[PDB]
Design a protein around this motif. Sequence first.
Motif, PDB file in Angstrom:
ATOM      1  N   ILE A  32      -5.913 -36.107  69.021  1.00 50.97           N
ATOM      2  CA  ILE A  32      -4.758 -35.215  68.714  1.00 50.97           C
ATOM      3  C   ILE A  32      -4.439 -35.266  67.217  1.00 50.97           C
ATOM      4  O   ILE A  32      -4.157 -34.257  66.600  1.00 50.97           O
ATOM      5  N   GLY A  33      -4.479 -36.433  66.631  1.00 48.42           N
ATOM      6  CA  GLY A  33      -4.177 -36.551  65.175  1.00 48.42           C
ATOM      7  C   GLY A  33      -5.405 -37.094  64.440  1.00 48.42           C
ATOM      8  O   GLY A  33      -6.313 -36.358  64.102  1.00 48.42           O
ATOM      9  N   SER A  34      -5.438 -38.375  64.187  1.00 46.98           N
ATOM     10  CA  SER A  34      -6.605 -38.966  63.469  1.00 46.98           C
ATOM     11  C   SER A  34      -7.157 -40.163  64.248  1.00 46.98           C
ATOM     12  O   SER A  34      -8.291 -40.162  64.685  1.00 46.98           O
ATOM     13  N   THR A  35      -6.362 -41.186  64.422  1.00 43.87           N
ATOM     14  CA  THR A  35      -6.838 -42.386  65.170  1.00 43.87           C
ATOM     15  C   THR A  35      -6.460 -42.277  66.649  1.00 43.87           C
ATOM     16  O   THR A  35      -5.610 -42.996  67.137  1.00 43.87           O
ATOM     17  N   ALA A  36      -7.087 -41.383  67.366  1.00 42.49           N
ATOM     18  CA  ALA A  36      -6.768 -41.228  68.815  1.00 42.49           C
ATOM     19  C   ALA A  36      -7.107 -42.516  69.580  1.00 42.49           C
ATOM     20  O   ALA A  36      -6.275 -43.041  70.294  1.00 42.49           O
ATOM     21  N   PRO A  37      -8.317 -42.991  69.407  1.00 41.38           N
ATOM     22  CA  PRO A  37      -8.751 -44.233  70.093  1.00 41.38           C
ATOM     23  C   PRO A  37      -8.196 -45.469  69.379  1.00 41.38           C
ATOM     24  O   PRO A  37      -8.921 -46.405  69.104  1.00 41.38           O
ATOM     25  N   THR A  38      -6.917 -45.480  69.085  1.00 42.95           N
ATOM     26  CA  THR A  38      -6.303 -46.653  68.391  1.00 42.95           C
ATOM     27  C   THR A  38      -7.204 -47.145  67.261  1.00 42.95           C
ATOM     28  O   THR A  38      -8.086 -46.442  66.805  1.00 42.95           O
ATOM     29  N   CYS A  39      -7.002 -48.352  66.821  1.00 45.43           N
ATOM     30  CA  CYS A  39      -7.856 -48.900  65.743  1.00 45.43           C
ATOM     31  C   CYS A  39      -8.885 -49.861  66.346  1.00 45.43           C
ATOM     32  O   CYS A  39      -9.546 -50.596  65.645  1.00 45.43           O
ATOM     33  N   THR A  40      -8.993 -49.867  67.654  1.00 42.17           N
ATOM     34  CA  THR A  40      -9.946 -50.780  68.356  1.00 42.17           C
ATOM     35  C   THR A  40      -9.492 -52.214  68.131  1.00 42.17           C
ATOM     36  O   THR A  40      -9.362 -52.654  67.014  1.00 42.17           O
ATOM     37  N   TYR A  41      -9.208 -52.922  69.193  1.00 37.78           N
ATOM     38  CA  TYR A  41      -8.704 -54.329  69.083  1.00 37.78           C
ATOM     39  C   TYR A  41      -9.327 -55.096  67.901  1.00 37.78           C
ATOM     40  O   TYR A  41      -8.700 -55.969  67.338  1.00 37.78           O
ATOM     41  N   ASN A  42     -10.532 -54.780  67.507  1.00 39.60           N
ATOM     42  CA  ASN A  42     -11.134 -55.507  66.354  1.00 39.60           C
ATOM     43  C   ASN A  42     -10.245 -55.309  65.134  1.00 39.60           C
ATOM     44  O   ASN A  42     -10.236 -56.109  64.219  1.00 39.60           O
ATOM     45  N   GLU A  43      -9.477 -54.255  65.130  1.00 38.78           N
ATOM     46  CA  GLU A  43      -8.558 -54.005  63.991  1.00 38.78           C
ATOM     47  C   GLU A  43      -7.720 -55.258  63.730  1.00 38.78           C
ATOM     48  O   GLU A  43      -7.331 -55.546  62.615  1.00 38.78           O
ATOM     49  N   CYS A  44      -7.441 -56.001  64.768  1.00 37.49           N
ATOM     50  CA  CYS A  44      -6.630 -57.241  64.623  1.00 37.49           C
ATOM     51  C   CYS A  44      -7.529 -58.487  64.615  1.00 37.49           C
ATOM     52  O   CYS A  44      -7.104 -59.565  64.979  1.00 37.49           O
ATOM     53  N   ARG A  45      -8.768 -58.346  64.217  1.00 39.73           N
ATOM     54  CA  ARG A  45      -9.694 -59.524  64.201  1.00 39.73           C
ATOM     55  C   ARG A  45      -9.035 -60.727  63.516  1.00 39.73           C
ATOM     56  O   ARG A  45      -8.961 -60.800  62.305  1.00 39.73           O
ATOM     57  N   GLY A  46      -8.561 -61.670  64.287  1.00 35.54           N
ATOM     58  CA  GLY A  46      -7.907 -62.871  63.691  1.00 35.54           C
ATOM     59  C   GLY A  46      -6.806 -63.377  64.626  1.00 35.54           C
ATOM     60  O   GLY A  46      -6.871 -64.473  65.142  1.00 35.54           O
ATOM     61  N   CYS A  47      -5.794 -62.580  64.843  1.00 32.61           N
ATOM     62  CA  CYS A  47      -4.678 -62.999  65.740  1.00 32.61           C
ATOM     63  C   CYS A  47      -5.191 -63.253  67.165  1.00 32.61           C
ATOM     64  O   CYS A  47      -6.356 -63.533  67.373  1.00 32.61           O
ATOM     65  N   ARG A  48      -4.330 -63.155  68.145  1.00 34.41           N
ATOM     66  CA  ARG A  48      -4.767 -63.390  69.554  1.00 34.41           C
ATOM     67  C   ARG A  48      -3.714 -62.863  70.539  1.00 34.41           C
ATOM     68  O   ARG A  48      -3.301 -63.556  71.449  1.00 34.41           O
ATOM     69  N   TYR A  49      -3.285 -61.642  70.366  1.00 33.41           N
ATOM     70  CA  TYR A  49      -2.265 -61.061  71.291  1.00 33.41           C
ATOM     71  C   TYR A  49      -2.670 -59.633  71.675  1.00 33.41           C
ATOM     72  O   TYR A  49      -3.840 -59.300  71.706  1.00 33.41           O
TER      73      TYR A  49
END
Length: 45
Positions: free
Chosen positions: A1-18
């Motif tokens: 619909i806009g730009s990041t439809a498929p979110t940023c892919t959990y890898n986007e948070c590579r480091g945390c754990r939630y």
Amino acid sequence: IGSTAPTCTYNECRGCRYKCRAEQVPVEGNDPINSAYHYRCVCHR
């Protein structure tokens, strides 16, 4: 619909754990011209 439809892919948070997810974040409101809406990835519980 806009730009990041498929979110940023959990890898986007590579480091945390939630829960990871990305969403649209406008800054110049929207009433006026539409040219100021980006997307970012967040990692909350």
